[PDB]
From a paper:
ACBD3 is a Golgi resident protein involved in the maintenance of the Golgi structure and regulation of intracellular trafficking between the endoplasmic reticulum and the Golgi. However, in enterovirus-infected cells, the ACBD3 GOLD domain interacts preferentially with viral non-structural 3A proteins, which causes re-localization of ACBD3 to the sites of virus replication. In this study, we present a structural, biochemical, and biological characterization of the complexes composed of human ACBD3 and the 3A proteins of four representative enteroviruses. The crystal structures revealed the details of the ACBD3-3A interaction, the 3A-3A interaction causing the assembly of the ACBD3-3A heterotetramers, the interaction between the ACBD3-3A complex and the lipid bilayer, and the roles of these interactions in facilitation of enterovirus replication.
To ensure that the 3A protein is fully complexed with the ACBD3 GOLD domain and to avoid the formation of partial complexes with 1:2 stoichiometry, we designed a GOLD-EVD68 3A fusion protein using a similar approach as for the GOLD-EVA71 3A fusion protein used for the crystallographic analysis. Taking advantage of the vicinity of the C terminus of the ACBD3 GOLD domain and the N terminus of the ordered part of the EVD68 3A protein, we connected the last residue of ACBD3 (R528ACBD3) through a short peptide linker (GSGSG) to the first ordered residue of the EVD68 3A protein (T163A/EVD68). Both GOLD-3A wild-type and LVVY mutant fusion proteins formed crystals, which diffracted to a resolution suitable for further structure determination. The crystal structures of the GOLD: 3A complex consisting of two individual proteins, the GOLD-3A fusion protein, and its LVVY mutant were almost identical with low root-median-square deviations, confirming that neither the fusion-protein approach nor the LVVY mutation affected the correct folding of these proteins. Three lines of evidence document the dimeric state of the wild-type GOLD-3A fusion protein and the monomeric state of its LVVY mutant in vitro. First, the retention volumes of these proteins in size exclusion chromatography are significantly shifted. Secondly, the small-angle X-ray scattering (SAXS) profiles of these proteins correspond to the calculated scattering curves of a dimer of the wild-type GOLD-3A fusion protein and of a monomer of its LVVY mutant. Nevertheless, we observed a significant difference in FRET efficiency between the wild-type GOLD-3A fusion protein and its LVVY mutant. These results confirm that the GOLD: 3A complexes are flexible enough to allow the formation of the heterotetramers consisting of two molecules of the viral 3A protein and two molecules of host ACBD3 even in cells at the respective intracellular membranes.
Residue numbers in the entry:
A (entry chain A): 365 to 436, 473 to 528
B (entry chain B): 16 to 58
The structure:
């Protein structure tokens, strides 16, 4: 049988001020998504890893968020369908079990925004 | 060491910076250095 892909988990947590303060302590964890832009963040599966955990937030506006899995032309699986989230109001978080070796694509989608740039604070971990 | 799905259930239910830091100390979760992540922009 082809690999069964686990459903992702998603949740929020309220402390967005503290989250962004923590993340701001490193420049590279802060992304500017221009008007009409889509920023993709590639997160490879670690050789000792089992799960991917993500957190993200924005400053003044919502943004589209999706997760895809790239198998190592290459096959792409939809893990979290892209949808607008109010990650300016709360920290958005989620996880997914490794379906196999490959690369996760975190997509921060600002396609729909004509006039607004978004600042994206994000963080990712993995488990053994 | 607990199972990954147990970690998952914990973080989902009582998520906080404190719980993250604790899981990190125990080496249950390991942070991906953001500077090692490939970031792509597309219009």
């Amino acid at each position: 049988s082809l690999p069964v892909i686990a459903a992702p988990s998603m949740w929020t947590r309220p402390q967005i001020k503290d989250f962004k303060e923590k993340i701001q302590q490193d420049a590279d964890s802060v992304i500017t998504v221009g008007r009409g832009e889509v920023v993709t963040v590639r997160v490879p599966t670690h050789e000792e890893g089992s799960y991917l955990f993500w957190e993200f937030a924005t400053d003044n506006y919502d943004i589209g968020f999706g997760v895809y899995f790239e198998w190592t032309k290459p096959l792409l699986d939809e893990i979290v369908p892209v949808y607008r989230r109010d990650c300016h109001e709360e920290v958005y978080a989620g996880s997914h079990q490794y379906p196999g070796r490959g690369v996760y694509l975190l997509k921060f989608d600002n396609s729909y925004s004509l006039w607004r740039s978004k600042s994206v604070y994000y963080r990712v971990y993995y488990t053994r | 060491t607990p199972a990954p799905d147990a970690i998952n259930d914990l973080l989902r239910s009582v998520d906080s910076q404190e719980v993250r830091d604790y899981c990190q100390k125990k080496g249950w979760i390991v942070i991906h250095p953001s500077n090692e992540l490939v970031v792509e922009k597309h219009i």
